[PDB]
Ligand binder design. Structure first.
Ligand SMILES: *[C@@H]1O[C@H](CO)[C@@H](O[C@@H]2O[C@H](CO)[C@@H](O)[C@H](O)[C@H]2NC(C)=O)[C@H](O)[C@H]1NC(C)=O
Ligand code: NAG
Length: 349
């Protein structure tokens, strides 16, 4: 059965001959990418057994690539997809001057036609997990990203957490993307939308990450975010719950963004963060107004933040923010006075 792949060498043929392909769980040899960019229309790929990856010390290497129209990527019960992160982690993540590691584990580009990815068990990935770009009408649910193994330090990170910059879902230049019922244990942004339209993220279980954050926007290929919805979700043991960041000195657009029904728990620094002073992955303290943020809604954002974090932190640019709505929020716990500068110099406290 050509449609039943037992080894990497049988993948190509399966993708060209079968609309229903079954990966039985093998190891992808070093330097070889699990190429699913040529999937036929209405094709279905099912992950079985344990899929593993050989070690490929290269930043630009992309282990898995998915493309096609009306395609379906799912897994069978008890299946597992290991990214071989333990072999890469050195607690520096995507840092240029660190050990070389695949930046994007899974690249979902050019996926359309009401395609969907569901019920996937992914674990131990290098850096960024999902790189969703140039896709539309796509649905991802029932996903379980577990990178807790990278929480502890190894022989390469010293006292640092092996895993770093392990974004769960990165979305860009996409439209009508829906994320529902997804578990994410990582060390960075649970879900980062640098650009896209009509994006929906609901029933999200983030933990140990940086929370559902927007951006950073600006300075990238695409700096336009219009129509994003974070609904019924839980952010625990994370740096931030709801964060909207923008690169300093850059231009872009962030409109129609709504955080609704978000429960926070044990936030480290920011319960709700909205700043436009990000430079080189770090806050500058001086926000710019190149990126226009408008129509932002914080509805029913409750929960608690660690004593070491601020309930609210809003650092908008000079006249670059407009239309902020706050309703039903109840964030408590912060040991540092909240600070924000829009719409006025007072916050929800
Ligand atoms: C979308 O893709 C699905 C497959 O995932 C298509 O439904 C399969 O189609 C053939 C008929 O052509 C049947 O033999 C199978 O029973 C189908 N499977 C399922 C799960 O339905 C469906 O036709 C596609 N939709 C469009 C609009 O093309
Ligand atoms: C073999 C085949 O059908 N190829 C198609 C193309 O004709 C169509 O435009 C597109 C969306 O429907 O999906 C693919």
């Amino acid at each position: 059965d050509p449609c039943s792949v037992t080894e990497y060498s049988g993948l190509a043929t399966a993708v060209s001959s079968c609309k229903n392909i079954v990966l039985n769980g093998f190891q992808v040899p070093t330097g070889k990418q699990l190429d699913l960019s040529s999937l036929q229309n209405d094709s279905t790929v099912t992950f079985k057994g344990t899929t593993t990856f050989a070690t490929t010390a290269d930043n630009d290497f992309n282990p898995i690539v998915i493309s096609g129209s009306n395609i379906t990527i799912t897994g069978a019960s008890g299946h597992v997809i290991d990214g071989n992160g333990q072999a890469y982690w050195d607690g520096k993540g995507s840092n240029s001057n660190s050990n070389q590691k695949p930046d994007h584990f899974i690249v979902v580009q050019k996926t359309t036609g009401n395609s969907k990815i569901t019920n996937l068990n992914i674990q131990n990935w290098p850096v960024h997990c999902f790189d969703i770009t140039g896709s539309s009408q796509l649905t991802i649910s029932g996903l379980i990203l577990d990178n807790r193994a990278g929480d502890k330090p190894n022989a390469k990170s010293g006292s640092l957490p092996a895993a770093h910059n392990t974004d769960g879902f990165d979305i860009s230049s996409s439209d009508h993307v829906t994320l529902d019922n997804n578990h994410v244990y990582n060390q960075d942004d649970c879900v980062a939308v640098t650009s896209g339209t009509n994006i929906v993220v609901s029933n999200m279980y983030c933990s140990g990450g940086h929370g559902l954050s927007i951006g950073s926007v600006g300075g990238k290929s695409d700096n336009v975010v219009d129509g994003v919805q974070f609904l019924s979700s839980q952010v625990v043991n994370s740096q931030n719950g709801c964060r909207i960041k923008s690169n300093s000195g850059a231009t872009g657009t962030i409109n129609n963004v709504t955080y609704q029904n978000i429960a926070l728990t044990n936030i480290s620094t920011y319960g709700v963060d909205v700043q436009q002073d990000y430079l080189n992955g770090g806050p500058t303290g001086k926000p710019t107004n190149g990126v226009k943020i408008s129509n932002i809604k914080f509805i029913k954002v409750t929960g608690t933040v660690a004593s070491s974090a601020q309930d609210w932190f809003i650092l908008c640019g000079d006249g670059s923010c407009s239309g902020f709505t706050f309703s039903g929020n109840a964030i408590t716990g912060g040991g540092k006075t909240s600070s924000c500068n829009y719409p006025t110099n007072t916050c929800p406290s």
